[PDB]
Write an enzyme that holds these catalytic residues in place. Structure first.
Site, mmCIF file in Angstrom:
data_model
loop_
_atom_site.group_PDB
_atom_site.id
_atom_site.type_symbol
_atom_site.label_atom_id
_atom_site.label_comp_id
_atom_site.label_asym_id
_atom_site.label_seq_id
_atom_site.Cartn_x
_atom_site.Cartn_y
_atom_site.Cartn_z
ATOM 1 N N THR A 1 0.872 -1.197 0.000
ATOM 2 C CA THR A 1 0.000 0.000 0.000
ATOM 3 C C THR A 1 0.887 1.216 0.000
ATOM 4 O O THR A 1 1.919 1.253 0.657
ATOM 5 C CB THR A 1 -0.926 0.063 1.238
ATOM 6 N N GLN A 2 0.460 2.226 -0.743
ATOM 7 C CA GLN A 2 1.224 3.435 -0.876
ATOM 8 C C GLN A 2 0.301 4.632 -1.039
ATOM 9 O O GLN A 2 -0.888 4.561 -0.755
ATOM 10 C CB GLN A 2 2.135 3.271 -2.095
ATOM 11 N N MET B 1 -1.601 -6.160 -2.560
ATOM 12 C CA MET B 1 -1.760 -4.979 -1.727
ATOM 13 C C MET B 1 -0.678 -3.937 -1.962
ATOM 14 O O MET B 1 -0.358 -3.166 -1.062
ATOM 15 C CB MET B 1 -1.767 -5.373 -0.251
ATOM 16 N N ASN B 2 -0.120 -3.924 -3.169
ATOM 17 C CA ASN B 2 0.927 -2.975 -3.546
ATOM 18 C C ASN B 2 0.646 -2.555 -4.984
ATOM 19 O O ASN B 2 1.359 -2.952 -5.909
ATOM 20 C CB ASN B 2 2.293 -3.644 -3.476
#
Lengths: 233, 233
Positions: free
Chosen positions: A1-2, A107-108
């Site tokens: 996540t970002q 999740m990235n």
């Protein structure tokens, strides 16, 4: 996540009788700071495809590298690389779509909204969207972010359904898009006046226009507006 | 000599030979004959199925890898299963990720490389099976010959297995003829059966003994066994 840092705004597009048109301004925002102005967000792949990218710019540059590799790789041990076995717009899209979904699943995500515009080998127009969630869809017109709210309504007034594509000329289409770019410059606080536009016609091939500008703007009426209610001067 | 240099694939003989690989090639020669030939519209596989007892079945020699590709085997059946299964995945990967059917030439390259890894490392063994791959892709009909040595070649026709040399000379003669059997599958198939019978000796191709497969322009790779091949005996 970002979280996205440098970002590109809208990417608008539509298809006409002989191909597709796609455009995106040349800005790379940094929050509310209009930081970079020579950013090209339209990525040509071969001569039958253009990938328009919005969202995080560092990820966009990463997708750029991925795209150059696809070309290199497709050329390996391929004697028909510039013919029957050249990259199709649909191959390029399925690839990116695949990556986008795998990245959201880990999740990235690649924090982008992408639109692949091109012409298949049999002449068919290709226009499909894919974003950071791996979500994909097609429509006679497609726009990302802000342009989804303001450009689609305009472009759909030209091509409202499939039967409208054969009735639309490059001139009408390019006109609609150019007007949409102006509207986006009027109401989108993260837009730039400069932009690039590309056309992929099954006859004239790929035409890539750089350094365009919103022109013929209406601002004169601003002089007649004073105060916010009762003020007279 | 040989005895001191044929203990494993990782050893070169004084003359630069790889005996384990050559012994593997021998398993192919001991295999039942199979033939492959193509025109510009179709590609055909004709294989002679071998039986153990007269109480046993005639082992299948044709495997479908995708709707547009398949192959015939000669040698160790298990090795054919492994290699064809790898080909099924490669075809599958191409479809899922790039929404593209795998080029027969690319499949040949992948098979060559998979086989090669088992000829340069200790512990493994070369594959002991030969394969004839046919397919219809974006550049037409194709026929490939795969040798365990890793050598894959594209031809108009060929044969492998015991007494394969008969059928091969026949095809090398019938070349100008069958290569033009476009638009007529039954003719190509009969031509294939005529080539294969050029390697008979023991018996004659019967109904539960003959196996045929075809792929082409508007023909998805399909296998014909038994009653379905009667009209060719």
């Amino acid at each position: 996540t970002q979280q996205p840092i440098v970002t590109g705004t809208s990417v608008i597009s539509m298809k006409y009788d002989n191909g597709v048109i796609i455009a995106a301004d040349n800005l790379g925002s940094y929050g509310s700071l209009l930081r970079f102005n020579g950013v090209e967000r339209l990525i040509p792949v071969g001569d039958n495809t253009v990938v328009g990218i919005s969202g995080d710019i560092s990820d966009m540059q990463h997708i750029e590298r991925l795209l150059k590799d696809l070309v290199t790789e497709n050329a390996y041990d391929n004697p028909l690389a510039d013919a029957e076995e050249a990259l199709e717009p649909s191959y390029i899209f399925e690839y990116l779509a695949t990556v986008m979904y795998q990245r959201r699943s880990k999740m990235n995500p690649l924090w982008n909204a992408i639109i692949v515009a091109g012409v298949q080998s049999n002449g068919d127009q290709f226009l499909r969207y894919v974003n950071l969630l791996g979500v994909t869809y097609s429509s006679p017109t497609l726009a990302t972010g802000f342009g989804a709210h303001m450009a689609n309504p305009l472009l759909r007034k030209v091509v409202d359904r499939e039967s409208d594509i054969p009735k639309t000329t490059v001139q009408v289409a390019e006109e609609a898009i150019v007007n949409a770019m102006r509207v986006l410059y009027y109401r989108d606080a993260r837009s730039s006046r400069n932009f690039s536009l590309a056309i992929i016609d099954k006859n004239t091939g790929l035409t890539f226009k750089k350094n365009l500008q919103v022109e013929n703007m209406k601002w004169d009426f601003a002089k007649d507006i004073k105060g916010y209610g009762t003020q007279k001067i | 000599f040989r005895n001191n240099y044929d203990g494993d694939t990782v050893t070169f003989s004084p003359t630069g030979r790889l005996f384990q690989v050559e012994y593997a090639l021998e398993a192919i020669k001991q295999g039942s004959v199979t033939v492959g030939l193509r025109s510009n519209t179709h590609a055909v596989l004709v294989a002679l199925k071998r039986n153990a007892d007269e109480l046993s079945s005639y082992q299948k020699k044709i495997i479908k890898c995708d709707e547009h590709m398949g192959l015939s085997l000669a040698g160790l059946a298990p090795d054919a299963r492994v290699l064809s299964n790898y080909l099924r995945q490669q075809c599958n990967y191409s479809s899922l990720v790039f929404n593209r059917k795998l080029a027969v030439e690319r499949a040949g390259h992948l098979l060559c490389d998979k086989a090669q890894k088992n000829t340069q490392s200790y512990g493994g063994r070369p594959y002991g099976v030969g394969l004839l791959i046919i397919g219809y892709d974006k550049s037409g009909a194709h026929l490939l010959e795969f040798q365990p040595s890793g050598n894959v070649t594209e031809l108009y026709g060929t044969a492998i297995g015991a007494r394969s040399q008969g059928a091969k000379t026949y095809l090398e003669r019938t070349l100008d003829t069958f290569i033009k059997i476009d638009g007529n599958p039954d003719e190509l198939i009969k031509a294939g059966v005529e080539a294969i019978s050029q390697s008979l000796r023991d018996e004659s191709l019967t109904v539960d003994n003959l196996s045929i497969a075809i792929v082409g322009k508007d023909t998805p790779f399909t296998i014909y066994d038994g009653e379905a091949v009667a009209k060719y005996i």
